[PDB]
């Protein structure tokens, strides 16, 4: 999906994320709901307060999907097929929202891995998140 250099940077950076993917996914969602309130409309059935167990549980699923993706950089379409259906076909998520969550995920990583979040790694992660976003909204294109 990305360049080989990018592939390397992403795999390396995610190794540093390690077992915090879940925690990070949850924090990224929290920063998105607070920062971009329009996004809350997709989660009526969710308790959005800080520490909500649903957000926590949901953060884990997001972190797992990103982990999967990192493992299948050469076949995102196939690996994320099921999620593309849900997001685009079932939920009709506005494509702009992917950009907002991407931003919130980078913010989170910056908070937690300041020494690992270098300009080169930031650039590779942005490319990765955009690639993931394209697959999730491809039922549009």
């Amino acid at each position: 999906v990305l360049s080989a250099a990018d592939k390397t940077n992403v795999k390396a950076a995610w190794s540093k994320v390690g077992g915090h993917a879940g925690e990070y996914g949850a924090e990224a969602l929290e920063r998105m709901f607070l920062g971009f309130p329009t996004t809350k409309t997709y989660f009526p059935h969710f308790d959005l307060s800080h520490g909500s167990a649903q957000v926590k549980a949901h953060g884990k699923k997001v972190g797992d999907a990103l982990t999967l993706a990192v493992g299948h950089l050469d076949d995102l379409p196939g690996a994320l097929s099921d999620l593309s259906n849900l997001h685009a076909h079932k939920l009709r998520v506005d494509p702009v929202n992917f950009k907002l969550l991407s931003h919130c995920l980078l913010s989170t990583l910056a908070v937690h891995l300041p020494n690992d979040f270098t300009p080169a790694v930031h650039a590779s992660l942005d490319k990765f998140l955009s690639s993931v976003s394209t697959v999730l909204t491809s039922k549009y294109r």
Binding site: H103, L106, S107, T108, A110, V111, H112, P114, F117, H122
Partner: peptide, 9 residues
């Protein structure tokens, strides 16, 4: 915003 996050943790 990302730089502020990086710097303030």
């Amino acid at each position: 915003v990302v730089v502020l996050a990086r710097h303030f943790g």
